[PDB]
Structure 1
Amino acid sequence: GLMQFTLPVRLCKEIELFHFDIGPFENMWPGIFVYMVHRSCGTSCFELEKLCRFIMSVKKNYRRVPYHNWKHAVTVAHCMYAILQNNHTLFTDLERKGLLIACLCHDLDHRGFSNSYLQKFDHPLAALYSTSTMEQHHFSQTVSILQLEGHNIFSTLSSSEYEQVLEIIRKAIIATDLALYFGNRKQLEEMYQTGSLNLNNQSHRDRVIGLMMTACDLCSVTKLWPVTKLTANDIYAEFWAEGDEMKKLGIQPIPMMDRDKKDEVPQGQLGFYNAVAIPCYTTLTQILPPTEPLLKACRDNLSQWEKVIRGEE
């Protein structure tokens, strides 16, 4: 009960910042997460024994893929932690509990392949789940782990609170399907501009949480340039393997996944910043003003990608 997690001084300070990098020491990532749960939620939100066993089971169910790995899970949870800490009073007790767990679990058992690749391969998961294939799998895996003996971190919620938090986690994880982001952000853009946005409207909160999940999921573009650039290597290491597997099915992959078009990556990054990232953090900054540092970091990184194209790096 009186057992806090404490971090070294540099981590204690930098972990509060949006652009924090969790570092290369894997063995510290569980403690970093628990630290964030304690400060975000309370030392009482979860039984420490149950939380630690849940964390280690989640870690085991992430695979050794270049990008959609355990480090990504913790990185996405930290971005959510920074959003929640900078918006203290906007979120319920259940929402703070649910969203950190949703983020940690959002890519459970990822194989390093898009929904598109599963559908073209005719993977069994594509028959079980026709849309948001991997994201329905990720939520399915989250429920499985919660149902292991000694792993139900929500046991002390009432029946209705338990149903609410699982519903928050499900929507949150489904919302990480980037195919759904475009429509979600358009709707939020209209609602904010016509002034109809209402955070007491549950359907509106869902949309806002969805955008928070996209923002946390893409947060690689909101780090300092050296982190952003080195993470892009891991992202493309996965995409180019998928591209290779497309060519094995006799399908030319999209240029994003074709390692033969490495040269066009800087231009490809521009389109991504302009079509996805900047719009995402702009709408998020409009709804939640204290998340502006994410939009500022993203704009800085767009500027660095423009400099790569102009041969200045």
Structure 2
Amino acid sequence: DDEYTKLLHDGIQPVAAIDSNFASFTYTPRSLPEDDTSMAILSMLQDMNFINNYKIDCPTLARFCLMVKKGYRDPPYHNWMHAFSVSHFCYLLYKNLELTNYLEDIEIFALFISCMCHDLDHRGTNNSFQVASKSVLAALYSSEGSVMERHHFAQAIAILNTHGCNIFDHFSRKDYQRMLDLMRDIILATDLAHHLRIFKDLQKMAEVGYDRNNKQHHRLLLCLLMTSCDLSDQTKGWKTTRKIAELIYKEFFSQGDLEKAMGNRPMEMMDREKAYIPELQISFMEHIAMPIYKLLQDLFPKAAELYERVASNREHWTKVSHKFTIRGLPSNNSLDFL
């Protein structure tokens, strides 16, 4: 494979070469062409000193990055561009929030690798759909819960177990065991049902203050940071929020259509005939995204701008809701749509 040849023999490009604003919270990683994303991953890993610190073999790393990218399918939202944008936000947190004062180096490295792998082989359907459709994934994981997240983790392990792809094969038994355990915890933390279960523990940690000597605080912070990366499309401008809503609802309505064909009644948000996008977006902002970034701001004062962008994006949806009502006649001047 020629992509691999170039990635290995051409040299890792400097991060600043990608974009002058690459390391800023205002940068939109989705603006980077998909063909440049595997090289951007290598550049971020190098800028974070992970390649040198952990003595990662370059042929192995190049193969791993390409295998992770190939491990994503093309649904509208849960594709490689989502994994890349989530990974870029983890890199932004490292560059702007001084994570090294809070987490161990192996934990920051595990968070980044988990961001790359966290939605591997997503089929554009959620956990409830797996169970309702009696998929092979549900047969394997429904008794434990977080069906898709267990599959994402198993796919990540399967890549590491592919010959020539194990970026941690030279690690000590203890460090290897630690990496794979962190990966499990972090990928499982991407289930928003898990986030909602631990929300009160996250609030309590923010209230008492982060204790770097408390192992449970490390586990909780990793969970919060992973959720913050996964929802990071909400921290950019209105243009990103709007585009992401189109992608998410295209994916959800496709599931809703499959559910109807199965004879089931899909949830309102999955039903293209019932869903009212501005209301659904405002609800997700108020009850999920805004509390996450408010917690992040409470723990990291420098994360204030992220909460303010999510709050402003919620106000933009309220501002444009009136446009979802047809006033006067449509463009064609006919009422044929009735």
Sort the TM-score into its range (normalised by shorter chain).
Answer: over 0.9
Distance 1:284 1:196 in 2: 12
Higher radius of gyration, 1 or 2:
2
Distance 2:33 2:24 in 1: 19
Identify which of 150, 159, 179 aligns with 2:193.
179
Are 1:108 and 1:141, in contact at CA under 8 Å, matched by a contact in 2? yes
- Cα deviation, residue 169, structure 1: 1.0
1:35 to 2:48 alignment = no
Is there any run of 5+ residues in structure 1 with no aligned partner, and where? none
Partner of 2:27: 20
Matches within 5 A, 1:136-285: 136-193=150-207, 195=208, 197-262=210-275, 264-285=276-297
Distance 1:96 1:8 in 2: 21
Identity %: 36
Are 1:188 and 1:197, in contact at CA under 8 Å, matched by a contact in 2? no
TM-score (norm 1): 0.93
- Cα deviation, residue 196, structure 1: 6.2
Name segments (4+ residues, structure 1) moved above 3 Å. Answer: 1-4, 310-313
Aligned CA distance change for structure 1 residues 43 and 128 (closer, same or farther; 3 Å): closer
* Paired letter, 2:171: L
* Paired letter, 2:41: F
Distance 2:297 2:15 in 1: 29
1:211-270, Cα deviation, whole Å (9 max, x unpaired): 1111110111111111221121111110000000110111111111111134x1101111
Are 1:41 and 1:97, in contact at CA under 8 Å, matched by a contact in 2? no
Identify which of 44, 59, 74 aligns with 1:49.
59
Distance 1:87 1:159 in 2: 31
Aligned CA distance change for structure 1 residues 175 and 270 (closer, same or farther; 3 Å): same
1:74 to 2:84 alignment = yes
Distance 2:46 2:309 in 1: 27
Identify which of 92, 96, 112 aligns with 2:108.
96
- Cα deviation, residue 97, structure 1: 1.8
1:297 to 2:304 alignment = no
Which secondary structure state, in structure 1, belongs to the residue aligned with residue 169 of structure 2?
coil
TM-score (norm 2): 0.87
Partner of 2:4: none
Aligned CA distance change for structure 1 residues 215 and 196 (closer, same or farther; 3 Å): closer
- Cα deviation, residue 8, structure 1: 6.3
Distance 2:293 2:214 in 1: 22
Are 1:118 and 1:126, in contact at CA under 8 Å, matched by a contact in 2? yes
Are 2:16 and 2:22, in contact at CA under 8 Å, matched by a contact in 1? no
Partner of 1:110: 122
* Paired letter, 2:124: G
- Cα deviation, residue 81, structure 1: 0.7
* Paired letter, 2:283: G
CA RMSD of aligned residues (A): 2.0
Aligned CA distance change for structure 1 residues 198 and 210 (closer, same or farther; 3 Å): same
1:164-192, Cα deviation, whole Å (9 max, x unpaired): 11111110100000111112222110232
Distance 1:267 1:303 in 2: 12
Q: Which of 1 and 2 has higher RCO (CA within 8 Å, sep 6+)?
A: 1
Partner of 1:83: 93
